[PDB]
Amino acid sequence: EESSESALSKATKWYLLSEIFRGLYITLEMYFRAPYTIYYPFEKGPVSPRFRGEH
Amino acid sequence: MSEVEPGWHYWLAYGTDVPPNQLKPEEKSVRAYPVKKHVPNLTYTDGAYVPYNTARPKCATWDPKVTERP
Ligand SMILES: CCCCCCCCCCCC(=O)OC[C@H](COP(=O)(O)OCC[N+](C)(C)C)OC(=O)CCCCCCCCCCC
Numbered sequence: 001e002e003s004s005e006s007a008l009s010k011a012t013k014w015y016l017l018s019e020i021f022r023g024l025y026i027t028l029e030m031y032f033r034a035p036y037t038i039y040y041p042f043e044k045g046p047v048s049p050r051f052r053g054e055h
Numbered sequence: 056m057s058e059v060e061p062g063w064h065y066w067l068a069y070g071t072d073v074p075p076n077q078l079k080p081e082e083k084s085v086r087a088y089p090v091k092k093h094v095p096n097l098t099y100t101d102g103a104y105v106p107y108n109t110a111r112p113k114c115a116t117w118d119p120k121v122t123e124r125p
Contacts (some may be wrong), residue, residue, distance in 0.1 A: 041056035047068035 057096040
């Protein structure tokens with residue numbers, strides 16, 4: 001008896017998948033962003049002057 | 056990837072803003088020995104590097120020598 005959202009308000013979010021559909025939309029945002037992928041071996045990742053490699 | 060010459064190989068890795076063909080002579084490498092063509096990694100081919108021991112055996116055997124009874 002001490003819930004702010006009425007019974008109908010909670011049922012609509014529950015039955016209509018309010019958070020899942022929001023979760024889907026945010027994923028779809030990343031579909032229109034530039035991927036981080038680089039193309040090895042045609043490109044290399046950054047290196048630092050302190051890099052420890054071949055003796 | 057190993058075909059990339061070592062001088063440029065550092066430039067392709069975003070470690071330097073000065074390409075190796077734009078170096079000032081005070082910074083380059085000056086060698087007393089010839090610098091032949093670049094050679095990549097040679098695995099899976101008969102030119103593969105073979106390790107070996109650079110040191111002679113620590114014990115030297117005796118050379119057979121005979122002098123007869125006086
Ligand atoms: C008249 C209205 C008609 C509505 C018809 C549609 C109803 C659908 C189901 C609603 C109930 C529900 O999803 O329920 C959630 C159920 C059971 O939850 P529970 O055990 O009660 O726990 C909740 C307890 N609460 C009440 C305290 C919160 O589990 C789930 O998370 C199911 C996840 C389903 C994911 C499917 C993804 C598909 C995506 C499709 C588009 C890309």
